[PDB]
Structure formats: structure tokens, C-alpha cells
Amino acid sequence: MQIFVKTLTGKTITLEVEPSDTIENVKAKIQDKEGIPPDQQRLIFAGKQLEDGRTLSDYNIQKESTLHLV
Ligand SMILES: [Zn+2]
Ligand SMILES: [Zn+2]
């Protein structure tokens, strides 16, 4: 699945992921993309605060879903 992550500046990061990727995995991908350390990252999808050890499917994140770094 393709997802979008919007940075604090509104920059778009396009990520290739799998339903079962954890939020931890996503944070490492964001690190590689923009150099933001994972401890510095806080993610939201549809107003839910996302936990590192849960998966994209766990939050009903889907193809073309947008996430926000907050
Ligand atoms: Zn895909
Ligand atoms: Zn993965």
C-alpha cells in the first residue's frame, strides 16, 4: 500500500508499506527520507494517536491514506 506522510511543514513523503508494518517501521522509513529521528516523531491518522508497536491495518490505514507528523 502507498501512504502519504505530511511533515510539520506540510511536505509530502510517499511511502511504500504493507498492511502489517508497525508504526515503528514507518517511523524508520520517515527517518531515512527526511532525517527526523524516530523519538522525534509523533504520528496521527484520522485524529488517532498512533502507537509504535501497532500496525497500519490495526488503525484501518489504507491505500492512499494520509498520516500527519504532529
Ligand atoms: Zn503497495
Ligand atoms: Zn515493511
Side-chain angles (χ1 to χ4, degrees):
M1 36 184 284
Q2 188 162 81
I3 63 171
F4 305 104
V5 176
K6 302 286 197 66
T7 71
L8 283 167
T9 70
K11 188 175 162 171
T12 307
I13 309 179
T14 302
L15 254 17
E16 186 46 32
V17 293
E18 293 195 285
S20 91
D21 263 318
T22 48
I23 298 290
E24 188 172 16
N25 285 353
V26 176
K27 287 194 182 167
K29 290 175 196 291
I30 291 166
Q31 183 176 34
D32 287 351
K33 286 270 194 193
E34 294 295 313
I36 312 162
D39 53 12
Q40 278 276 76
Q41 291 177 46
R42 186 205 204 204
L43 286 161
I44 294 301
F45 169 55
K48 311 178 286 192
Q49 202 160 309
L50 312 180
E51 291 169 339
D52 280 28
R54 284 271 63 83
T55 68
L56 300 181
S57 57
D58 287 336
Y59 293 116
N60 265 187
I61 288 163
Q62 282 158 36
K63 340 95 222 16
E64 305 298 281
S65 288
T66 295
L67 290 178
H68 284 289
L69 274 163
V70 292

